[PDB]
């Protein structure tokens, strides 16, 4: 997709796997 | 077959709605 | 939900609380209307302790299920066993029939020895959990403990009147249950109801007496009851009500939550045998149920009617067929035990399940005849042998407790050790097939406390009293802390670099805000349930979502206020999609919900075909004005791996080894040119050697789980040094015959893996020191460089690059609209930027760029096929000079050739590929091989070989070996010259900025640029790699990504994203409009 190597706002595993809103809309 | 046969089928499936 | 076969209302188990433990004690409650037993939550509810009931008589044994289903067995003599094939339940009573007592073996070895000789004890084995029922002095069998095969016991404590007063889970916590008189006693009901559960203590014995009215208690859950004893409210760990129920004669007629969900029910008769006749959902669908002799028709508020068909009576009734809203009919077949053995989709494809023995299943057969055998031990009932569709077998060896000590797969054997006395099922030592050994440590909650990898680096984890992760330590000692509210929701995430995230939730537990320490946050608005309604980012942009009664997204509004429409058929399948620019696509499906046709905005229809397993088999791309109709055929292996991808111009064949690793990938072009990439793998499926066509083989030196520490190409050896996090910190290159290293590249990393400093020292004297600066968001806000001018970056609140200020130069300011479209110098509705950088852009009906006119008069025409792939372009310069280029692609949309016609002279360049990475550029008299770093698109080194066209007999030999899927022998290689090796020296993003030869000198140097990735140069063919995965086309000036073409002068792609809305709201945006932070390697 669009990997953000430096930015950890959304590409970081901790920052994206801990978001319930973004982790529940996937399916 | 006759051993451990319930008198009613489980309601797990199918399910409709919420 | 409502079970149309029976007409009853079922509420599946809802976990009120589940504190972490080796065997977590989940306090799950469920409701079934047909259940007539009046429990501690009213009629129809089941709770822990009162879920499963056991009755033993002199003539029969009855095991009442959680749902109240009476499973009948013959008389259970002491020591006897009973198996329920239909229910997969094992019952064994303790004691002996009179003979010599023997220790229980097989599936009964996990029970304690004292329980085996107790005549008044019965063990129930439901799956992997053992239930201990003990007969009490009043003659009622009630659950005493629920232990697994590892011995984690969940004691249940009963008192007088048969009340479950206390529960002690496997982690030592003590739970106290409080009962109060809620209604007057009647027949079959004493009136006592469970008014809540108290976490009495976390360790040690529970207090002897607990006063329910005493303040300061820890109420994990609380319940409210009406005057009739029906459960009307459920309260969370706090005082907040989270569930509300309404009852008519002890029948659930309305359930929901405060806000969010509200469902009402209507019954033909208010009794346990009554059936739901109408299910009204607030803001959703109202369903009406009509019950026939052997079918149930479920009408809908949208007019859809679904028919559920069933056969049999009593407990043997099974759901046999399903006729959907459009008449599609799915059928199910059952064996004599009621287990599912066949399943036919609406197209007629049948999935079989052959069962044998007491394991209930041994083989499943796909419609494409793909068998997944699964052998289970006859005595212990545990998995022993597993075989997939390619006849690859996994063999499990187990110890006395059923723990898989060794797992023997197609690639070596993995060995497990269980050396923790407290937790005999947690592995404390894992040895991979390659031989690397990992060590694990566990705490009293059964959670991972320390992980030591193969290299000896230790990851540590910390938990609170309730088993929630609150601190993580990496091998470098960087802490990642977490904060939780009493409800257990994550409200704070402090990262290793000091950046802290804070989360907010509504009453329903849905996430509503994600904020940083800076202050700017993203807001979430929700509609009904988990249906997102609005997302507002830090920059003020909003994505509004509109849903219909069926919960289907019918409109999407982007930041510019432009709507994208969606339409659906009776099966909730997208049949029409209008984009933000008016591009309308229509879809067609067969009976099995498979996309078989897709009409696009220009009226051209693409038809799809599938094999028996549902995988894509062929795509019939329609003919366009500049390309003929083409058929792309795909063939798959039984396990789902791609075997071939045929097209009109290329035939890609994939060959796999006995393990499934991609061993050979051969690409045979239509004109006979063959390019093959061969790999060798270790026991972990990590590439060890790679041969890219006729280039010299590349040997990868890896340790542990594939961490690269060396590379060998020809006479050149690369060496990598890594830190405790296995991040590269030093890189060397040495050539045989030279004492000194060709270059040394040292790197320093920020706590979150961000590159902080880098220093490159070539042997020729080129010194490149680069220092990186980041802000609180992790955005690169500055680069200190001694070879190139230092640059300072500015970003808006939305994360887009606003300006870049090189030292001693004018700033390059960029302006965007709401949606993220660059504005030269209001908005671009439809996301089609028709004027930027002094150029006029013209798009076709499908959004592809078909015309670019510059200020000087330069004209660039683009032509596409029916797959939206650029197949022909014409470029006219201001000097009245023309240029024509044609491109060829394989079935995977990878550009395999480039034919550029200029002044009547035709030059052809062929490209070889290694998966998604382009690794060859076959010119007329030169083969240029690019080797990328493993597992990424960062170029590592380049190989150049002088070559000549292959003789006709050699081409036939190459095609022969390609057909059989075997690599060409090294003795038949052509007369290629000695390979010249050059090394890529990339920046933080993997964009090559320098190119060094075998003597440490510089061959190519590129000045960094914001959107072009490199300042324009006279000869872009000397080094065509820009960004990651982009190839600079010299003839047109476009950057070829994997799937699309990128406009360097516009900072956007020339065509819409093939993924559509899946890629993002803007189909043309590149790298989130932050080319200094992100990249698109596959162009998606």
- DSSP codes, C609-663: EE-TTS-EEEEEEPP-SSS--EEEEEEE-TTS-EEEEE-SSEEEEEEE-SSS-EE
How far apart are alpha carbons C393 and C410 in whole angstroms? Answer: 6
> If you write DSSP's letter for every residue of C87-154 in order, what string do you get?
TTEEEEESS-SSS------GGGTTS-HHHHT-TTEEEEEETTEEEEEEE-TTS-EEEEEEEETT----
> Quick one: CA torsion of C816, C820, C826, C829, rounded to 10 degrees?
160
Q: What long-range pairs does C621-626 form, CB within 8 A, spacing at least 24?
A: C621/C865, C621/C866, C621/C867, C622/C866, C623/C866, C624/C863, C624/C864, C624/C865, C624/C866, C625/C863, C626/C863, C626/C864, C626/C865, C626/C871, C626/C872
Alpha carbon distances (Å) from C841 to C849, C857, C859, C871, C875: 7, 13, 10, 19, 14
As beta bridge partners, residue C321 has C309, C331
| R_g over Cα of chain B | 12
| Cβ-based contacts of C498 with chain A (< 8 Å) | none
C641: its two tokens = 């791996």
How far apart are alpha carbons C930 and C942 in whole angstroms? Answer: 5
Element (H, E) at B7: none
Element (H, E) at C5: none
How far apart are alpha carbons C90 and C782 in whole angstroms? Answer: 68
Contact (CB<8Å) A5/C989 = yes
Residue with token string 């402090």: C494
| Phi, psi angle pair for C954, to nearest 5° | -70, -35
How far apart are alpha carbons C218 and C199 in whole angstroms? Answer: 6
Residue with token string 């609209």: C817
Determination approach: cryo-EM
How far apart are alpha carbons C800 and A16 in whole angstroms? Answer: 20
How far apart are alpha carbons C386 and C410 in whole angstroms? Answer: 11
* Helix (H/G/I), strand (E/B), else coil: C351: strand
C3: its two tokens = 């079970």
How far apart are alpha carbons C65 and C409 in whole angstroms? Answer: 39
Secondary structure of C377-424 as H, E, C letters: CCCCCCEEEEECCCCCEEEEEECCCCCEEEEECCCCEEEEECCCCCCC
Contact (CB<8Å) C71/B6 = yes
C165 within 8 A of C159, measured Cβ to Cβ: yes
Secondary structure of C976-1002 as H, E, C letters: CCCCEEEEEEECCCCCEEEEECCCCCE
Nearest CA in chain C to A24: C530
Alpha carbon distances (Å) from C40 to C177, C189, C227, C229: 11, 9, 15, 9
Contact (CB<8Å) A8/C499 = yes
How far apart are alpha carbons C913 and C653 in whole angstroms? Answer: 12
C291: its two tokens = 């019950």
Burial (Cβ within 10 Å: 0-12, 13-18, ≥19) of residue B6: buried
Contact (CB<8Å) A21/C780 = no
Half-sphere exposure of residue C30: CA atoms within 13 angstroms, side-chain side: 21
A7 within 8 A of C779, measured Cβ to Cβ: yes
Break sites following residues in chain C (C–N > 2.5 A): 825
End-to-end C-alpha distance for chain B, whole angstroms: 34
Whether the ω angle into residue B14 lies within 30 degrees of 0, i.e. cis, is yes
Resolution in A: 2.5
Task: Give the distance from residue C749's alpha carbon to the nearest chain B alpha carbon, in angstroms.
Answer: 50
How far apart are alpha carbons C534 and C527 in whole angstroms? Answer: 9
Give Cα A10 to chain centroid, integer Å. Answer: 4
C789: its two tokens = 């001018």
| R_g over Cα of chain A | 9
C1067 within 8 A of C810, measured Cβ to Cβ: no
Length of chain B: 18
Task: Give the distance from residue B10's alpha carbon to the nearest chain C alpha carbon, in angstroms.
Answer: 7
Alpha carbon distances (Å) from C1022 to C267, C788, C1001, C1018: 78, 20, 16, 9
How far apart are alpha carbons C124 and C141 in whole angstroms? Answer: 12
Please list, in sequence order, all residues whose beta carbon lies within 8 angstroms of the beta carbon of residue C728, skipping any fewer than 6 positions away.
C708, C720, C721, C722, C747
End-to-end C-alpha distance for chain C, whole angstroms: 39
Beta-sheet pairing, C81-84 with C89-93: antiparallel
Q: What angle do CA C491, C495, C497 make, to 5 degrees?
A: 145
| Cβ-based contacts of A11 with chain C (< 8 Å) | 1078
How far apart are alpha carbons C949 and C923 in whole angstroms? Answer: 10
Q: How many CB pairs under 8 A join A and C?
A: 83
Task: Give the distance from residue C83's alpha carbon to the nearest chain B alpha carbon, in angstroms.
Answer: 7
What ranges in C915-1041 are assigned the alpha helix state H? Answer: 952-964
C780 within 8 A of C772, measured Cβ to Cβ: yes
C133: its two tokens = 């029922």
User: Of C1018, C1025, C934, whose CA–CA distance to C987 is shortest?
Assistant: C1025
C253: its two tokens = 């007629």
Task: Give the distance from residue C150's alpha carbon to the nearest chain B alpha carbon, in angstroms.
Answer: 27
C511 within 8 A of C518, measured Cβ to Cβ: no
How far apart are alpha carbons C170 and C25 in whole angstroms? Answer: 8
Of B4, B12, B17, the CB nearest to C2: B17
Please list, in sequence order, all residues whose beta carbon lies within 8 angstroms of the beta carbon of residue C30, skipping any fewer than 6 positions away.
C10, C11, C12, C13, C14, C45, C46, C66, C67
C999: its two tokens = 């003597």
Q: What long-range pairs does C343-350 form, CB within 8 A, spacing at least 24?
A: C345/C591, C345/C592, C346/C591, C346/C592, C347/C590, C347/C591, C347/C592, C349/C592, C349/C612, C349/C614
How far apart are alpha carbons C44 and C51 in whole angstroms? Answer: 11
| Phi, psi angle pair for C381, to nearest 5° | 65, 35
Quote the DSSP letter at residue C715: T
Whether the ω angle into residue C901 lies within 30 degrees of 0, i.e. cis, is no
Burial (Cβ within 10 Å: 0-12, 13-18, ≥19) of residue C737: exposed
- Number of C-beta neighbours around residue C960 at 10 A: 12
Give Cα C1043 to chain centroid, integer Å. Answer: 22
How far apart are alpha carbons C86 and C358 in whole angstroms? Answer: 11
- Is the CB of residue C514 less than 8 Å away from at least one CB of chain A? yes
Give Cα C326 to chain centroid, integer Å. Answer: 32
As beta bridge partners, residue C490 has C484
As beta bridge partners, residue C129 has C126, C148
How far apart are alpha carbons C669 and C891 in whole angstroms? Answer: 11
Contact (CB<8Å) C493/A15 = yes
C754: its two tokens = 């961000």
Of A6, A21, A24, the CB nearest to C754: A6
As beta bridge partners, residue C511 has C505
Length of chain C: 1084
Give Cα C252 to chain centroid, integer Å. Answer: 37
* Helix (H/G/I), strand (E/B), else coil: C962: helix
Element (H, E) at A24: helix A20-24
C831 within 8 A of C1055, measured Cβ to Cβ: no
- Is the CB of residue A1 less than 8 Å away from at least one CB of chain C? yes
Nearest CA in chain B to C61: B4
* Helix (H/G/I), strand (E/B), else coil: C513: strand
| Phi, psi angle pair for C1013, to nearest 5° | 70, -10
Quote the DSSP letter at residue C160: G
How do the residues of chain A divide into helix, strand and coil, expressed in percent and rounded to 5? Answer: 35, 5, 60
Please list, in sequence order, all residues whose beta carbon lies within 8 angstroms of the beta carbon of residue C266, skipping any fewer than 6 positions away.
C253, C276, C277, C278, C279, C280
Alpha carbon distances (Å) from C1030 to C550, C1011, C1039, C1079: 42, 12, 6, 10
C366 within 8 A of C351, measured Cβ to Cβ: yes
> If you write DSSP's letter for every residue of C842-881 in order, what string do you get?
EE-TTS-EEEEE-TT--EEEEEE-TTS-EEEEEEE-TTS-
Buried/exposed C787-802: b ≥16 CB within 10 Å, e otherwise? ebebbbbebbebbbbb
Which chains neighbour A (Cβ–Cβ under 8 Å, 3 or more pairs)? C
Q: Which of residues 60-79 of C touch B (CB under 8 A)?
A: 63, 65, 67-74
* Helix (H/G/I), strand (E/B), else coil: C1071: helix
C1055 within 8 A of C1044, measured Cβ to Cβ: yes
Of B6, B10, B17, the CB nearest to C281: B17
C970: its two tokens = 């090294």
- Is the CB of residue A17 less than 8 Å away from at least one CB of chain C? no
How far apart are alpha carbons B17 and C603 in whole angstroms? Answer: 38
Please list, in sequence order, all residues whose beta carbon lies within 8 angstroms of the beta carbon of residue C487, skipping any fewer than 6 positions away.
C236, C237, C238, C509
Beta-sheet pairing, C707-713 with C164-168: unpaired
C730 within 8 A of C745, measured Cβ to Cβ: yes
| Cβ-based contacts of A8 with chain C (< 8 Å) | 495, 497, 499, 752, 754, 778
How far apart are alpha carbons B14 and C9 in whole angstroms? Answer: 11
Q: Which of B1, B2, B9 to mutate to test the interface with C (most CBs of C within 10 A)?
A: B9
- Is the CB of residue C799 less than 8 Å away from at least one CB of chain A? yes
* Helix (H/G/I), strand (E/B), else coil: A21: helix
C101: its two tokens = 């007592």
How far apart are alpha carbons C11 and C278 in whole angstroms? Answer: 16
> If you write DSSP's letter for every residue of C206-229 in order, what string do you get?
PPS---TT-TT--EEEEEEE-TTS
- Number of C-beta neighbours around residue C495 at 10 A: 19
- Is the CB of residue C1047 less than 8 Å away from at least one CB of chain A? no
Please list, in sequence order, all residues whose beta carbon lies within 8 angstroms of the beta carbon of residue C1020, skipping any fewer than 6 positions away.
C1032, C1034
User: Of C167, C227, C172, whose CA–CA distance to C197 is shortest?
Assistant: C167
| Cβ-based contacts of C287 with chain B (< 8 Å) | 16-17
How far apart are alpha carbons C739 and C718 in whole angstroms? Answer: 14
Quote the DSSP letter at residue C362: S
End-to-end C-alpha distance for chain A, whole angstroms: 18
User: Of C459, C496, C989, C494, whose CA–CA distance to C751 is shortest?
Assistant: C496
- Is the CB of residue A27 less than 8 Å away from at least one CB of chain C? no
How far apart are alpha carbons C476 and C324 in whole angstroms? Answer: 57
Nearest CA in chain A to C779: A7
| Cβ-based contacts of C489 with chain A (< 8 Å) | 20
Residue with token string 């659906």: C568
| Phi, psi angle pair for C890, to nearest 5° | -95, -170
User: Of C928, C881, C911, C414, whose CA–CA distance to C684 is shortest?
Assistant: C414
- Is the CB of residue A26 less than 8 Å away from at least one CB of chain C? no
C555: its two tokens = 């409109």
Contact (CB<8Å) C778/A24 = no
- Is the CB of residue A4 less than 8 Å away from at least one CB of chain C? yes
C341 within 8 A of C335, measured Cβ to Cβ: yes
Contact (CB<8Å) A4/C1081 = no
* Helix (H/G/I), strand (E/B), else coil: C37: coil
Contact (CB<8Å) C287/B15 = no
How far apart are alpha carbons C234 and C237 in whole angstroms? Answer: 10
Strand ordering across the sheet containing C8-15: C2-3, C8-15, C28-32, C45-46
Contact (CB<8Å) A20/C505 = yes
Task: Give the distance from residue A19's alpha carbon to the nearest chain C alpha carbon, in angstroms.
Answer: 8
C1042 within 8 A of C1082, measured Cβ to Cβ: yes
| Phi, psi angle pair for C696, to nearest 5° | -60, 145
């Amino acid at each position: 997709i669009i990997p953000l190597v430096v930015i950890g706002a959304f590409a970081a595993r901790a920052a994206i796997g801990a978001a319930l809103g973004a982790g529940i809309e996937l399916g | 077959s006759a051993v451990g046969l319930a008198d009613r089928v489980s309601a797990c499936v199918p399910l409709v709605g919420k | 939900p409502v079970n149309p076969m029976l007409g009853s209302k079922l509420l599946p188990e809802e976990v009120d609380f589940a504190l972490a433990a080796p065997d977590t004690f989940t306090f799950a409650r469920g409701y079934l209307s047909s259940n007539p037993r009046i429990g501690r939550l009213g009629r129809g509810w089941w709770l822990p302790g009162e879920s499963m009931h056991l009755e033993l008589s002199e003539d029969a044994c009855v095991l009442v299920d959680a749902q109240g289903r009476r499973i009948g067995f013959p008389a259970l003599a002491p020591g006897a066993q009973h198996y329920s094939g239909s229910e997969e339940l094992w019952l064994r009573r303790g004691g002996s029939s009179g003979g010599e007592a023997q220790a229980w073996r097989g599936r009964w070895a996990a029970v304690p020895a004292e329980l085996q000789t107790q005549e008044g004890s019965v063990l129930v084995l439901s799956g992997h959990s053992y239930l201990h029922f003990q007969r009490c002095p009043d003659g009622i069998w009630r659950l005493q403990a629920s232990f697994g095969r590892a011995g984690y016991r969940t004691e249940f404590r009963w008192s007088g009147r048969g009340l479950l007063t206390g529960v002690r889970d496997s982690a030592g916590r003590s739970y106290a249950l409080v009962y109060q008189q809620a209604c007057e006693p009647s027949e079959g009901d004493d009136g006592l109801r469970l008014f809540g559960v108290i976490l009495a203590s976390h360790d040690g014995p529970p207090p002897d007496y607990i006063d329910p009215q005493s303040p300061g208690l820890d109420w994990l859950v609380r319940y409210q009851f009406s005057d009739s004893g029906d459960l009307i409210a459920v309260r969370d760990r706090l005082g907040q009500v989270v569930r509300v129920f309404a009852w008519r004669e002890h029948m659930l007629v309305a359930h929901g939550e405060p806000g969010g969900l509200e469902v009402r029910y209507e019954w033909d008769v208010h009794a346990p045998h009554g059936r739901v006749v109408k299910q009204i959902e607030a803001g959703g669908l109202t369903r009406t149920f009509r019950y026939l002799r052997d079918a149930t028709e479920v009408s809908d508020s949208l007019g859809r009617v679904e028919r559920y068909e069933f056969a049999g009576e009593g407990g043997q009734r099974r759901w046999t067929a399903l006729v959907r809203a459009d008449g599609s009919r799915s059928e199910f077949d059952y064996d004599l035990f009621g287990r599912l053995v066949a399943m036919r989709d609406p197209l007629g494809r049948e999935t079989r399940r052959r069962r044998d023995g007491q394991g209930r299943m041994l083989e499943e057969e796909s419609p494409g005849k793909a068998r997944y055998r699964k052998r289970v031990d006859e005595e212990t009932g545990l998995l022993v042998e597993l075989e997939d569709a390619m006849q690859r077998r996994w063999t499990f060896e187990r110890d006395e407790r059923g723990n898989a000590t060794t797992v023997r797969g197609p690639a070596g054997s993995t060995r497990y050790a269980y050396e923790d006395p407290r937790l005999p099922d947690r592995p404390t030592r894992i040895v991979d097939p390659r031989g690397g050994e990992r060590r694990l440590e566990w705490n009293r909650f059964g959670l991972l406390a320390a992980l030591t990898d193969c290299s000896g680096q230790v990851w540590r984890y910390d938990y609170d009293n309730e088993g929630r992760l609150v601190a993580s330590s990496d091998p470098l000692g960087q802490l990642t802390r977490r904060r939780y509210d009493p409800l257990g929701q994550l409200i704070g995430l402090e990262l290793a670099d000091g950046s802290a995230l804070s989360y907010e939730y509504d009453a329903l537990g849905r996430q509503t805000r994600i904020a940083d320490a800076e202050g700017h946050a993203t807001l979430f608005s929700w509609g009904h349930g988990d249906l997102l309604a609005r997302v507002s980012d830090a920059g003020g942009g909003e994505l509004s979502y509109l849903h219909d009664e069926a919960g289907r997204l019918v409109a999407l509004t982007n930041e510019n206020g432009v709507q994208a429409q969606f339409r659906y058929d009776l099966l909730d399948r997208l049949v029409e999609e209008t984009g933000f620019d008016g591009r309308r696509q229509r879809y067609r499906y067969n009976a099995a919900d498979e996309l078989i046709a897709r009409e696009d905005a220009d009226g051209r229809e693409t038809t799809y075909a599938y094999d028996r397993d549902g995988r894509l088999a062929s795509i019939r791309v329609p003919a366009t004005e500049h390309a003929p109709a083409l058929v792309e055929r795909y063939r798959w292996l039984a396990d789902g791996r791609l075997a071939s991808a045929g097209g009109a111009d290329c035939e890609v064949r994939y060959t796999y080894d006995e393990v499934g690793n991609l061993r050979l990938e051969s690409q045979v072009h239509a004109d006979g040119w063959v390019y093959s990439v061969e790999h060798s793998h270790d026991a972990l499926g990590v590439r060890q050697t790679s041969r890219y066509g006729d280039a010299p083989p590349v040997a990868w030196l890896t340790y542990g789980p594939g961490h690269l520490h060396g590379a060998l190409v020809g006479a050149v050896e690369l060496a990598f040094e890594r830190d405790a996090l296995h991040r590269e910190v030093r890189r060397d290159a040495r050539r045989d015959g030279q004492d000194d290293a060709l270059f040394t590249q040292e790197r320093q990393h920020a706590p979150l893996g961000r590159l902080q400093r880098s220093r490159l020292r070539l042997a020729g004297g080129f010194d490149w020191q680069r220092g990186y600066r980041y802000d609180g968001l992790g955005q690169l806000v500055g680069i200190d460089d001694n070879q190139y001018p230092s640059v300072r970056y500015e970003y808006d609140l939305g994360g887009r690059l606003l300006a870049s200020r090189r030292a001693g130069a004018a700033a390059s300011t960029y302006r965007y609209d709401a949606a993220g479209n660059r504005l030269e110098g209001a908005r671009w509705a439809g996301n089609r930027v028709e004027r930027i950088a002094g150029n006029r852009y013209r798009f076709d009906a499908l959004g592809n760029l078909v015309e670019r006119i510059g200020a000087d008069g330069e004209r660039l025409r683009l032509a596409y096929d029916g797959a939206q792939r650029l197949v022909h372009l014409t470029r006219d310069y201001a000097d009245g000079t023309r240029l024509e280029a044609r491109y060829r692609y394989d079935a995977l949309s990878r550009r395999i050739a480039k034919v550029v016609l200029r002044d009547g002279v035709e030059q052809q360049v062929r490209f070889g590929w290694d998966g998604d990475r382009q690794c060859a550029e076959a010119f007329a008299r030169e083969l240029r091989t690019t080797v990328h770093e493993p597992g990424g698109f960062v170029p590592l080194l380049r190989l150049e070989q002088a070559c000549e066209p292959d003789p006709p007999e050699l081409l036939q030999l190459r095609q022969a070996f390609a057909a059989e899927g075997q690599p060409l022998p090294a003795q038949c290689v052509p007369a290629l010259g000695e390979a010249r090796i050059a090394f890529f020296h990339t920046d933080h993003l993997g964009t090559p900025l320098q190119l060094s030869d075998e003597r440490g000198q510089l061959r190519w140097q590129g000045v960094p640029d914001d959107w072009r990735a490199v300042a324009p140069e006279r000869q872009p063919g000397a080094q065509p790699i820009r960004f990651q995965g982009q190839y600079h086309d010299e003839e047109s000036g476009l950057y070829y990504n994997r799937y699309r073409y990128y406009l360097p002068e516009a900072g956007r792609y020339a065509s819409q994203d093939p993924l559509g809305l899946g890629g993002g709201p803007n189909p043309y945006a590149y790298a989130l409009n932050a080319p200094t932070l992100a990249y698109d390697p596959t162009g998606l």
